[model samples]
Structures are given as structure tokens and as C-alpha cells.
Target: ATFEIVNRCSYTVWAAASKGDAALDAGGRQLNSGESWTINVEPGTNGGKIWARTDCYFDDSGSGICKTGDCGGLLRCKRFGRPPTTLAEFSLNQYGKDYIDISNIKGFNVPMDFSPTTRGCRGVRCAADIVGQCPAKLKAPGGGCNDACTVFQTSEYCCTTGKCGPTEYSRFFKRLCPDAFSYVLDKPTTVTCPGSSNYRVTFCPT
Candidate 1:
């Protein structure tokens, strides 16, 4: 399977993607506005995620931190990015299906669109300007909106008890991007695309 990562924002964005010990398009690069990168994945790839890092300042040795979506303060992420990042998660060729979603469960940093280039699958997106309307309590210092779980760290917000559902905060995110995963257990956003389809992931898509 393969996918294209496109940056449409006016400013540069650092694209990061990972799965297990292998890295897809490893050694994350600065994708200037309008630039893109394509990645091919092995069959049955699982636990995959792609995100954008903003407000970064890396040195010659590629050691630095990003304002949002910093993954271990490294140019190439060895793990998932921190909270307050827009995430595109996927599991290909799993149980005879391809699972995917634009998740804000960790909160949103940028607008994103994920669409299958192949004919059988439909598009999914979380393209709202969430940072601009982020609730004051859930707002991050640099940018982006922190998830309710990150802000409160409680059972109600984090759903730790497994008996929880959407609250005012989760509803706030849901209302803005109805197709996104707003809470930890948010399920309506998941899409089951067909297997072996090429996809396009766009940041700041117009």
C-alpha cells in the first residue's frame, strides 16, 4: 500500500509517520508549503500514524523541539507525537479491512484530510480551524487545542473508568469536526476502507 503526504499550508510543516521498528519516509523532513512526500507500506502494516509538527527549530545535528506535535524532541520520531496534534491513524490489511480515521482524541493541531485515491473508498476529514476556536481552558500555549483528558486528567474526561461518555468538552470538539474522533473511545469517526488502496493525506487542504 502507498500514500501521499501533501502540505498545503502557507508555512513549512514537519511531517512524521511511523509503524513499529520501521519508519515510513523516515528521518522526517521539512515539507515546505506545497511540497509532498510519498510512502509505500508493507502489507498488513499496523499501528500507523501520521502527523504534522509546527513551530520547530532544529540545529545542524537535527536536535530540537516543536511547539506542537513534538515526538521526543527528535527530527525523526521513535514514538508517537505528544498531545494536541491532528492525527491520521491507519491499519491496513487487518481482518480483511483497512481501518482509518482523522483522530482528535489527542486533540487537534492542524486541519487534515484523508481520502483514498482508489475508487471504492470514501474520503474523511477534520478540516476545521479548531485552534482559532479552541476553548480557553483547553488551549495550548503555543497553538492547538489540548484534549479534555490532557487538561483535566479525570475519569469523566479521560474515560478511564470505561463508564464515561461525551461531556461538554468532547461535545465541543465533536461539533466542530463531526467526523473526527473527539474522545478516547469515540468510534463514529472510524472508516473501514477496502484493502490495498492508495490514499492521500493532506494538511491544511483547501
Candidate 2:
């Protein structure tokens, strides 16, 4: 499997992807506007995720902080991005298929789309610009939209213990980007493609 990360935003973005127990792509390099990077992911890689870190300032040694979607202040991330990030989660070649989704269950920092390059597979996208329209309570620090869980951090909003349905906050994200996972129990947003499919994850795609 492979992933193509495309940057369509007006400014540069630092793109990051994590595939467990392997070398990461570009060591989380800066992807200038209109640029793209293709990463070859080994088959059977599990629990992989891709996201972008914005408003970063890294020294020559590649250490810095990001305004949103940072991974423990590291350039090469082996763990999931922080909350308020737009995540493209993937489990490749699982049960003979590729399970994927664009999740706002954590929150959204950038507009994104995930699509399979192979024929006969449907694409999933959450292209709405959530930053500009984020509600006051669910707003992020620098930019992006915060999840209800991130904001409230309670049982009603976080649903940390039991099965729960959508809240008003989840509904807000769903109304704007119905294809994304607005909350923890949002199962229907997950999409699958053939295991052979190669994916394209685009930032700020219109």
C-alpha cells in the first residue's frame, strides 16, 4: 500500500504519517503549498494514521512545536497526532480489505479527503473548512475545531466508558461534515476499499 500526501493550502504544511515499527516518510518534512509526497507503506501495517501539523517552527535539527496536530513535539511520529487534528486513520489489509476513515472524533484542523487510486473503490472526504466556522466552545487554541470530548471532557461529551450516541456538539460537526466520524460511536463514517488500493490524502482539497 502507499499514500500520497498533497498540500493544496495557500501556506506550507508539515505532513506526518506513522506506520508502526518502521521508518517514517520524510522524517516529517515541510510540504510547501502545491507540493505532494508519496509514501510507500508496507503491507500489513496496522493502526497507521496520517495528518498535518500547521504553524510550526523547527530548528535545523528538526525539533519544534506545532500549533495544531503535533505529535509530542517530534518530527517523526510513531504515535497518533494530538486532538484538534484532522486524522486519516487506516488499517491496511485487514480482513482482506482496507479500513479507513476521516475522523473528527478528536477534532479537525484542516480540510481533508481520502481516496483510493484504484478503480471501483469509493472515496471519503471531509472538505469543509471547519476552522473558520468552529463554534466558540469547541474552538481550538491556534486554529481548527475542537471535539466535544476535548472541550467538555465528561461522560456526556467524551463517552469514555459506555456506548453513547451523538451530542449537540457531535451533531454540529456532522452537520458540516457528514462523512467524518463526529464522535466515538460514529461507526457509519468508516469506509473500506480493496486491500490493493493505494490512497491519496489531500489537505485543503476543493
For each candidate in turn, the TM-score is: 0.95, 0.94
Task: Please give the lDDT score at residue 81 for candidate 1.
Answer: 83
Most accurate candidate by lDDT: 1
lDDT of each: 0.87, 0.84
Model 1, 69-151: lDDT tens digits are: 88878888767888788999899999888988888889999899999988787889988889999999999997899999988
Q: Assess the local accuracy of residue 62 in candidate 2 as a C-alpha lDDT between 0 and 100.
A: 72
Q: Model 2 residue 17 lDDT?
A: 89
For residues 1-206, could you state the per-residue lDDT of candidate 2 as single tens digits? Answer: 87899999888888888864444555476889999999988777777788888998887777778888787787776666677889888888887898888888889998899999887578888988788888899898788889998888898778878878888889988988999889888857778788868989999999
lDDT of 1: 0.87
Whole-model lDDT, model 2: 0.84
Candidate 1: list runs displaced more than 4 Å: 20-22
- Could you tell me the lDDT of residue 180 within candidate 1? 90
